Amino acid sequence: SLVKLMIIEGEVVSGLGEGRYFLSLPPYKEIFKKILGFEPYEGTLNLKLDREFDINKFKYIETEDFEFNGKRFFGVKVLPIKILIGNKKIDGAIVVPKKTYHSSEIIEIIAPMKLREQFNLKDGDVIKILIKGDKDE
Amino acid sequence: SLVKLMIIEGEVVSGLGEGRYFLSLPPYKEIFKKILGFEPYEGTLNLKLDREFDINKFKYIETEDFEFNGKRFFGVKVLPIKILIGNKKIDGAIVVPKKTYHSSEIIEIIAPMKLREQFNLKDGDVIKILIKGDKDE
Ligand SMILES: Nc1ccn([C@@H]2O[C@H](COP(=O)(O)OP(=O)(O)O)[C@@H](O)[C@H]2O)c(=O)n1
Ligand SMILES: Nc1ccn([C@@H]2O[C@H](COP(=O)(O)OP(=O)(O)O)[C@@H](O)[C@H]2O)c(=O)n1
Numbered sequence A, B: 001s002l003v004k005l006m007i008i009e010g011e012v013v014s015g016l017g018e019g020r021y022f023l024s025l026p027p028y029k030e031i032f033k034k035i036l037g038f039e040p041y042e043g044t045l046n047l048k049l050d051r052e053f054d055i056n057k058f059k060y061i062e063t064e065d066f067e068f069n070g071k072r073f074f075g076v077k078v079l080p081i082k083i084l085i086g087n088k089k090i091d092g093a094i095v096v097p098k099k100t101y102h103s104s105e106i107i108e109i110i111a112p113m114k115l116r117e118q119f120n121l122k123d124g125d126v127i128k129i130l131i132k133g134d135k136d137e
């Protein structure tokens, strides 16, 4: 058999607090836990890559639309990854809205810990993510 | 930036002594040394994979035809790899004739040591090879 791996460097960047909002919603929390087998920290780590990232080149899991506290929320595409910081690894996932006007060089990742606090990460620090497999594996 | 890796399991198999012949020829010995930066053991380790291997999907190096002791020999396609046996790694390369009637599930690898003796490998033992990059990287 064979295994394909891709390791991508990403530069830590900041959003405007969107992910701490969305990741506070129980339907997203609960579905991420079911898919990924961990309870995500409430937030997303934004990473700036040097090429656009297209989740459709991989075997992602898609979640469903839902309504919560009266507002409509849309499903997301989720791709399990490993996060590599120095010699440590952390289970995580790339999360992308299910509909986007184009693929971005900015990705958002979820993990079971606050990565900035655990690893003292500041904007500009570079870390790596590892993806196993692709859409044809 | 990103790095792509592919790790493929191969089962140790035997040829009929072809590679010890070809790898004894000084033009092949010398060109492999120049390309790869190691002096190959005189022989090739044959490995049986569970899918066909196509060297043309990777960034291989092609050698030139030559004449030696009066006979014509043809250039080969060479792809640097790591050989993984347990927790050890060895620099090596996949070598394929430059013209073949089709891609095979059997590959031949060269290395700077006799792998069978160094690692006590018998027909049927399984090892791994690692390839970094592909034709578009
Ligand atoms: N697993 C995570 C998730 C978010 N974060 C960080 O936690 C904070 C809150 O997440 P957020 O989704 O609101 O991100 P920003 O839009 O604030 O960059 C930000 O500083 C993220 O970079 C983290 O360090 N580890
Ligand atoms: N780097 C290498 C090259 C060949 N070999 C083995 O060395 C012997 C001689 O190589 P060969 O190219 O004549 O292969 P066969 O056709 O004998 O299988 C064979 O037993 C190969 O499996 C090795 O263990 N390590």
Ligand code: NA
Pocket: A015, A017, A018, A019, A020, A043, A044, A045, A046, A108
């Ligand atoms: Na975020």
Ligand code: NA
Pocket: B015, B017, B018, B019, B020, B043, B044, B045, B046, B108
């Ligand atoms: Na051989």
